[PDB]
């Protein structure tokens, strides 16, 4: 029973999965990946559209996490802003690894490597994608890991860090159990998942540097992205 979810944990897991499965990528965007013109300009604009959708989806997923809307309102904002980049990279890794057809993923990578973005930041992104892929996580593990990243008591400007920690700890307990259910032969699996959260945190710096570099034809970001990234 150290590896069996209690009824309340199973209810919590269903609730997180419902919220996680609710929204995916709009076909408008996946269609553009496939048929839009190929240029550094077009590719950068698709990637900003994808990022804007990522933020929208993340807000909606986060609002439905149990307890989140009971938190102080400024802390809610602080969590959404603090987690945005890590959650984007985690989501985009899943999309690249598991949610797109082969060919969609091939063309998306080709567009990523030809969008005016420096290889200094593209190379670690694809290294992380493969590093996450190696873990061969289930959808449940991805969803729980994402909620753990979002509900981090360590983000800047949180007023009531204990309240966030109380929300995050049940998710960690669930994920521990999920690792023993889904990879029973690999006892280090849960530690490996948290080890990847360390690499994931390197993208706060990577993203901040990328924002300082050139932007194809010096194109701008959407208002929402400017706001969540403090541009």
């Amino acid at each position: 029973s150290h590896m069996e979810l209690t009824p309340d944990q199973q209810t919590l897991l269903h609730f997180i999965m419902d919220s996680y499965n609710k929204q995916r990528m709009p076909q408008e965007i996946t269609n553009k990946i496939l048929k839009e013109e190929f240029s550094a300009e077009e590719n950068f604009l698709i990637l900003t559209e994808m990022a804007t959708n990522h933020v929208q989806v993340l807000v909606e997923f986060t609002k439905k996490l149990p307890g989140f809307q009971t938190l102080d309102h400024e802390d809610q904002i602080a969590l959404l802003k603090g987690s945005a980049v890590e959650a984007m990279f985690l989501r985009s890794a899943e999309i690249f690894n598991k949610k797109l057809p082969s060919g969609h993923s091939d063309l998306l990578e080709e567009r990523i490597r030809n969008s005016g973005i420096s290889d200094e930041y593209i190379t670690p992104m694809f290294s992380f994608y493969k590093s996450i892929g190696e873990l061969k996580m289930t959808q449940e593990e991805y969803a729980l890991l994402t909620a753990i990243v979002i509900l981090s008591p360590d983000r800047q400007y949180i007023k009531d860090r204990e309240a966030v920690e109380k929300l995050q700890e049940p998710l960690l307990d669930v994920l521990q159990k999920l690792c023993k259910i889904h990879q029973p032969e690999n006892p280090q699996h849960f530690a490996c998942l948290l080890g990847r959260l360390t690499e994931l945190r390197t993208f706060n710096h990577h993203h901040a540097e990328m924002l300082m570099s050139w932007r194809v034809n010096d194109h701008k970001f959407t208002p929402l992205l400017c706001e969540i990234w403090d541009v």
């Binding site: 807000v59 609002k63 809610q76 904002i77 959404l80 802003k81 929402l224 706001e227 969540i228």
Partner: peptide
């Protein structure tokens, strides 16, 4: 206000 767009999305049913 600060973070107007994020607050819009957070408080929008």
């Amino acid at each position: 206000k600060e973070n107007a767009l994020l607050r819009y999305l957070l408080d929008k049913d």
